[PDB]
Ligand SMILES: COc1cc(/C=C/C(=O)O)ccc1O
C-alpha cells in the first residue's frame with residue numbers, strides 16, 4: 256500500500272496511480288517572482304461560523320478532522336472560485352524536523368508543516384462525485400512555522416494521544432476552524448490535484464501567503480503519532496508530505512501585489 260517510506264513513498268506512487276505524472280499535479284513550488292498578480296481575483300470568503308466538526312481520525316497517513324457537510328455550514332467562496340464549496344475535513348502534513356514538512360514551497364522554502372482545509376463544489380452533490388471533476392474541490396493551504404503557539408490548534412494537539420495509531424478515531428465536536436487561520440487572506444492560486452493517492456486532478460489550490468505560527472511543543476505532538484496500527488511496531492508519523500511536482504503548463508496567480 257502507498258505511504259511515505261523508502262519502498263512505498265512518493266517516487267513509487269506512479270505505479271499504482273499513473274496520474275502521479277500528470278499535467279496538473281500538486282504540490283508545486285510557488286516562485287513568488289513568477290506568480291502574477293491578477294486584479295480580477297476577488298477576496299476569499301471563508302464562512303466558518305456555523306461549522307460542525309464531528310470527529311478526528313488517524314487514517315495511517317495523517318489525521319483528519321471531519322465536518323458535517325450535509326448542508327452549507329462551513330463554506331469557501333469567492334477568490335478564484337465559482338459557486339460554493341463545503342468544508343469536509345482538514346488535515347496536516349509535517350516533518351521530522353522544523354526545516355521540512357510542507358508540501359508547497361515558496362521560492363524553494365519549506366515550512367515545518369502545512370494545513371489543508373478540503374472543500375467540495377456543491378454543484379456536484381457529494382465529495383465522491385466532485386473529485387471526478389476538474390473544478391470539484393477547493394483546498395485552502397496554510398503554512399505552519401515554529402515559533403509562538405497557536406491557541407486555536409491546542410484542542411487538536413491535546414486529542415492526538417487518543418488517536419495515536421492507524422484506524423483510531425475520537426469525538427471532536429465543537430471545534431472552530433477559524434482559530435487556525437492567519438490574519439491575512441492574501442493567497443496564490445493554481446489548478447492542481449490531491450497530494451495523496453488517488454492524486455486526482457480536481458483541485459483549485461488556494462495557498463495563503465501568511466503562515467501561522469505553532470510552538471515547538473505543538474509540532475512535537477504531531478510527531479508522536481504513528482503510521483502503524485495498535486499492536487504493530489512503532490513507526491512515527493513524520494514526513495508525510497509529497498514534494499514539489501513539475502508546474503508544467505500552469506500559471507500561479509497572486510491575489511496581492
Ligand atoms: C480520496 O478520499 C479523500 C481524500 C481527501 C484529500 C486528499 C488530499 O488532500 O490529498 C479528503 C477526503 C477524502 O475522502
Ligand SMILES: [Zn+2]
Pocket residue numbers: 346347348371450
Ligand atoms: Zn493534504
